[PDB]
Amino acid sequence: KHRIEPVCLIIRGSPGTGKSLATGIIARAIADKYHSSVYSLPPDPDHFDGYKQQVVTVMDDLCQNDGKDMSLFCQMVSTVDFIPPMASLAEAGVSFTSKFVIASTNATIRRRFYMDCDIEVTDSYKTDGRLDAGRAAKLCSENNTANFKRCSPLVCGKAIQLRDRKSKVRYSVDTVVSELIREYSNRSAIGNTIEALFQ
Amino acid sequence: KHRIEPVCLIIRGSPGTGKSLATGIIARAIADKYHSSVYSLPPDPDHFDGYKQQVVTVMDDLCQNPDGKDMSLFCQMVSTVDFIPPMASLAEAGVSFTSKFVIASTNATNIISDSDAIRRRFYMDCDIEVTDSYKTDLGRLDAGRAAKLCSENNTANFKRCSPLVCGKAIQLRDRKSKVRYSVDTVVSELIREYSNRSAIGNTIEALF
Amino acid sequence: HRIEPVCLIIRGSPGTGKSLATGIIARAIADKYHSSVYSLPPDPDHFDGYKQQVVTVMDDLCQNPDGKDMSLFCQMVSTVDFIPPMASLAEAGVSFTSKFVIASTNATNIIVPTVSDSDAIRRRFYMDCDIEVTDSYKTDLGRLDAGRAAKLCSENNTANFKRCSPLVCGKAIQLRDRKSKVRYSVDTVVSELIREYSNRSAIGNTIEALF
Amino acid sequence: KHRIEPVCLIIRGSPGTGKSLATGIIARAIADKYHSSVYSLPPDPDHFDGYKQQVVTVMDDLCQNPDGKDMSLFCQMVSTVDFIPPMASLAEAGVSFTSKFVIASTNATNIISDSDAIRRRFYMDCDIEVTDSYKTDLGRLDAGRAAKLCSENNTANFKRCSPLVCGKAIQLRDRKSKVRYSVDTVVSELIREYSNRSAIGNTIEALF
Numbered sequence: 103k104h105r106i107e108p109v110c111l112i113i114r115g116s117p118g119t120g121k122s123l124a125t126g127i128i129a130r131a132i133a134d135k136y137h138s139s140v141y142s143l144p145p146d147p148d149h150f151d152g153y154k155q156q157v158v159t160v161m162d163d164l165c166q167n168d169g170k171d172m173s174l175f176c177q178m179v180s181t182v183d184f185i186p187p188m189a190s191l192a193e194a195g196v197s198f199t200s201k202f203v204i205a206s207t208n209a210t211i212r213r214r215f216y217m218d219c220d221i222e223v224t225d226s227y228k229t230d231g232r233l234d235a236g237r238a239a240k241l242c243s244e245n246n247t248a249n250f251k252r253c254s255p256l257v258c259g260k261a262i263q264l265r266d267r268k269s270k271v272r273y274s275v276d277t278v279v280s281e282l283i284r285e286y287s288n289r290s291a292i293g294n295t296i297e298a299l300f301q
Numbered sequence: 302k303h304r305i306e307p308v309c310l311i312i313r314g315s316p317g318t319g320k321s322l323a324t325g326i327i328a329r330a331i332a333d334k335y336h337s338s339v340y341s342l343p344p345d346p347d348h349f350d351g352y353k354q355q356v357v358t359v360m361d362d363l364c365q366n367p368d369g370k371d372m373s374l375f376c377q378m379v380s381t382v383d384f385i386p387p388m389a390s391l392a393e394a395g396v397s398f399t400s401k402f403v404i405a406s407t408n409a410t411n412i413i414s415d416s417d418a419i420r421r422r423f424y425m426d427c428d429i430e431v432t433d434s435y436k437t438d439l440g441r442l443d444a445g446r447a448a449k450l451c452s453e454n455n456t457a458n459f460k461r462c463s464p465l466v467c468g469k470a471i472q473l474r475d476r477k478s479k480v481r482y483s484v485d486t487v488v489s490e491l492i493r494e495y496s497n498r499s500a501i502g503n504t505i506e507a508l509f
Numbered sequence: 510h511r512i513e514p515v516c517l518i519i520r521g522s523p524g525t526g527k528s529l530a531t532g533i534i535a536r537a538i539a540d541k542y543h544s545s546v547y548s549l550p551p552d553p554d555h556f557d558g559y560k561q562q563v564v565t566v567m568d569d570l571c572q573n574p575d576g577k578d579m580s581l582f583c584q585m586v587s588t589v590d591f592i593p594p595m596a597s598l599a600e601a602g603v604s605f606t607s608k609f610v611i612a613s614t615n616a617t618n619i620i621v622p623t624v625s626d627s628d629a630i631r632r633r634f635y636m637d638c639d640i641e642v643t644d645s646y647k648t649d650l651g652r653l654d655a656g657r658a659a660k661l662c663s664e665n666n667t668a669n670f671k672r673c674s675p676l677v678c679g680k681a682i683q684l685r686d687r688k689s690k691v692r693y694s695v696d697t698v699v700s701e702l703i704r705e706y707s708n709r710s711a712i713g714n715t716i717e718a719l720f
Numbered sequence: 721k722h723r724i725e726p727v728c729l730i731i732r733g734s735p736g737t738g739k740s741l742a743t744g745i746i747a748r749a750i751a752d753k754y755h756s757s758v759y760s761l762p763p764d765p766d767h768f769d770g771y772k773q774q775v776v777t778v779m780d781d782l783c784q785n786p787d788g789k790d791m792s793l794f795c796q797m798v799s800t801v802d803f804i805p806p807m808a809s810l811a812e813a814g815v816s817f818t819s820k821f822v823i824a825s826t827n828a829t830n831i832i833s834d835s836d837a838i839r840r841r842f843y844m845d846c847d848i849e850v851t852d853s854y855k856t857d858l859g860r861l862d863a864g865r866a867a868k869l870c871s872e873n874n875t876a877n878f879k880r881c882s883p884l885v886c887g888k889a890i891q892l893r894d895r896k897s898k899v900r901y902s903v904d905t906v907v908s909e910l911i912r913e914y915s916n917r918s919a920i921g922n923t924i925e926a927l928f
């Protein structure tokens with residue numbers, strides 16, 4: 103009765119650094135490549151109201167100051183069945199199918215993080231030491247990106263880059279949405295192949 | 302072509318608890334910050350007659366009675382996709398609906414099909430609550446006693462203070478997070494919520 | 510007491526299709542026993558998720574420090590009781606009842622760290638096999654060509670499957686026991702694993718039978 | 721108040737050689753003749769849970785590596801003097817140990833203070849010994865093969881036969897006599913030495 107383990111990225115950084123933008127954009131890149139929307143979870147999640155099998159789920163400020171969420175998140179990313187709590191009985195009993203889970207913590211178990219990354223602000227866009235949001239938001243003239251319709255220093259790597267703690271590698275918003283898509287495509291390719299033989 | 306989804310507040314309480322003067326007051330407070338006026342939607346509204354780009358548009362006695370045509374239009378009001386409203390005379394027809402906030406009122410317990418994306422257009426839904434000092438003989442608001450001014454003003458958003466406002470007489474309970482709010486601080490929170498709702502949305506949506 | 514779970518390790522170079530074999534073998538064994546499969550991660554510290562699925566699978570078993578891997582895996586494949594570690598305390602306390610373990614590694618590296626005993630853990634594998642890619646499905650780089658290898662066959666002569674593809678037959682990929690130098694496909698390896706577990710459930714029937 | 725020392729068997733062999741299935745299979749063949757059951761002691765026993773007056777008590781991995789606490793009670797297992805054991809719950813507390821035999825198993829080469837009057841509690845001390853035809857690739861036994869039923873039965877103690885029982889697979893060689901036995905004949909022997917144990921004492925110590 104079961105499914106493929108969602109691909110997961112945690113972005114880690116001290117506040118003010120643009121973590122929630124990083125996830126908003128990444129999530130919706132991915133969501134758009136699959137012709138879907140983003141389901142965006144409030145902090146201290148209790149109920150999943152709004153969840154109608156969106157392709158990506160984003161968790162903001164995961165693990166704030168009693169470990170409910172790490173137990174909620176642990177059944178979001180697995181192959182076991184998970185049917186999340188809902189407030190109104192009208193939509194209760196829907197299965198949690200999201201292919202990706204994007205999330206952010208603060209700065210300073212893991213196995214389900216396909217990628218575990220630090221957010222970093224490059225210095226032209228650093229500000230009195232946290233990001234300059236209006237000046238990094240304004241749009242690049244060129245677009246070299248794999249995943250976007252038009253570009254901006256949040257996407258490029260100009261303002262913010264993502265640094266994976268496990269592999270030491272740098273990414274941008276754009277290349278990591280490409281790396282999250284590749285890895286899932288790997289996973290579905292296998293599973294769909296092996297599911298095929300038992301239907 | 303689209304806009305930012307107005308931060309909506311509706312108030313629920315037994316009749317006469319004051320939720321109509323609540324909306325009227327927190328409506329125009331927001332409209333004095335933004336140098337605009339307020340458009341008052343009539344109950345069971347057929348048309349938007351006389352609406353000119355007000356930063357606030359209130360909606361009183363929402364869902365007052367069936368057929369609930371108020372719900373087709375409300376969902377069209379608090380939303381990202383673009384709307385040109387129903388209008389009687391063809392002089393002012395076509396105005397795009399620009400209101401930054403939408404405030405409403407309804408009755409105490411009444412549940413007002415698709416039951417979830419419908420209530421995320423409430424950023425905030427309060428149960429109006431009246432202090433016993435100002436609660437009257439049948440349990441509603443004594444508005445003669447409650448409208449007399451306070452000697453000092455601790456409020457950020459008003460030129461003068463009254464217990465309607467500093468919460469002595471009138472208070473608002475979050476239904477989600479069950480918060481005790483005076484109306485001076487429910488205007489703080491809604492203008493604060495669309496101050497940053499303007500920030501995040503337009504940088505994001507630019508990329509798509 | 511419990512029966513020693515019967516264990517298959519599969520060694521090969523990257524791109525030769527190890528986790529498709531472990532995947533497919535595991536879920537064929539799962540279905541005959543009307544159960545599901547449990548997948549450990551790499552460098553695995555904990556079993557959260559273990560409902561006592563009949564088959565546990567360790568992908569990429571060797572992480573090549575391997576102190577952790579072998580000393581825990583020594584504890585899973587054994588006749589004694591085993592209570593695995595957990596992170597949630599909700600399902601902490603469950604016992605490891607899986608009847609098969611299917612694992613994958615890389616070829617001709619040194620398995621156990623010392624640590625060791627090298628003999629003590631090596632008898633724990635009932636079958637130790639090399640995954641070989643037949644030369645019509647090796648692409649350049651010697652990698653399994655997985656797209657064609659998945660294409661279903663039009664004849665099905667198989668013990669354990671309803672549909673057939675070169676991943677099952679032995680057309681595309683095969684496993685050969687190191688100790689036996691005899692060849693299996695994923696279909697014939699499944700049949701062998703099921704036979705062994707049958708033979709390990711026999712020995713209790715036959716000890717009682719004499720009283 | 722005391723009674724006859726249980727004739728004891730200890731088996732010795734490398735791990736996997738089968739001496740655990742041996743102790744329990746000879747334990748059960750004795751306890752069927754005497755209509756008893758077997759009380760299986762866990763490794764490193766802290767208490768005897770639910771031991772109720774079985775004829776046979778099997779002690780496994782005896783003289784285990786941690787404390788030799790296995791020795792403290794074993795010395796009071798087969799002995800002359802009365803023993804009421806340690807118990808978790810006070811539901812069964814005070815029941816004396818009447819088991820007529822005690823069978824153990826150890827490791828192969830491990831020597832397990834006052835050594836002499838104690839090694840006499842083994843009536844028989846044995847080395848488990850595994851036939852090449854049944855000896856596994858690395859020297860253990862193939863219990864899969866070795867458990868196949870024999871077409872024949874010339875065993876005196878069992879309802880069917882198997883190479884564990886008839887010596888074809890599994891064999892026991894005494895340390896003193898160096899006589900090699902199957903388990904079928906070495907169960908004939910222990911009950912036989914018990915018969916000797918029972919007869920000689922009752923006449924005699926009725927005098928003292």
Ligand SMILES: Nc1ncnc2c1ncn2[C@@H]1O[C@H](COP(=O)(O)OP(=O)(O)OP(O)(O)=S)[C@@H](O)[C@H]1O
Pocket residue numbers: 115116117118119120121122123124145162163
């Ligand atoms: N007044 C507030 N009360 C409670 N939570 C708030 C408030 N203002 C913002 N937040 C939360 O703050 C979070 C954003 O975290 P920040 O403090 O901005 O750190 P940050 O995410 O690294 O900075 P970003 O990514 O540019 S928003 C969001 O999830 C909001 O829900």
Ligand SMILES: Nc1ncnc2c1ncn2[C@@H]1O[C@H](COP(=O)(O)OP(=O)(O)OP(O)(O)=S)[C@@H](O)[C@H]1O
Pocket residue numbers: 315316317318319320321322323361362442444
């Ligand atoms: N023209 C008026 N101007 C100011 N206050 C008024 C006026 N008419 C009545 N009031 C009083 O001011 C209050 C206005 O808010 P309310 O009418 O109590 O809110 P509400 O009664 O819950 O909403 P509804 O739709 O009228 S039931 C009432 O309690 C009246 O007693």
Ligand SMILES: Nc1ncnc2c1ncn2[C@@H]1O[C@H](COP(=O)(O)OP(=O)(O)OP(O)(O)=S)[C@@H](O)[C@H]1O
Pocket residue numbers: 521522523524525526527528529568569613
């Ligand atoms: N140079 C490399 N760097 C990192 N990962 C690699 C590299 N080469 C191969 N891999 C990975 O290692 C796996 C090799 O295992 P295989 O024997 O080929 O079976 P597979 O189907 O190719 O992969 P599995 O099944 O997930 S273990 C591949 O799946 C790749 O994801």
Ligand SMILES: Nc1ncnc2c1ncn2[C@@H]1O[C@H](COP(=O)(O)OP(=O)(O)OP(O)(O)=S)[C@@H](O)[C@H]1O
Pocket residue numbers: 510511512513588712713733734735736737738739740741742780781861862863
């Ligand atoms: N539940 C079981 N029922 C029957 N046989 C079993 C069972 N579990 C394991 N076996 C096998 O039956 C034999 C039991 O005897 P053994 O335990 O090997 O003797 P031993 O290994 O020297 O003693 P120890 O204390 O277990 S090291 C072994 O070959 C086991 O592999």
Ligand SMILES: [Zn+2]
Pocket residue numbers: 242244245253254255257258
């Ligand atoms: Zn750019």
Ligand SMILES: [Zn+2]
Pocket residue numbers: 451453462463464466467468469
């Ligand atoms: Zn006041």
Ligand SMILES: [Zn+2]
Pocket residue numbers: 661662663664673674675677678680
């Ligand atoms: Zn085929």
Ligand SMILES: [Zn+2]
Pocket residue numbers: 870881882883885886887888
């Ligand atoms: Zn025989």
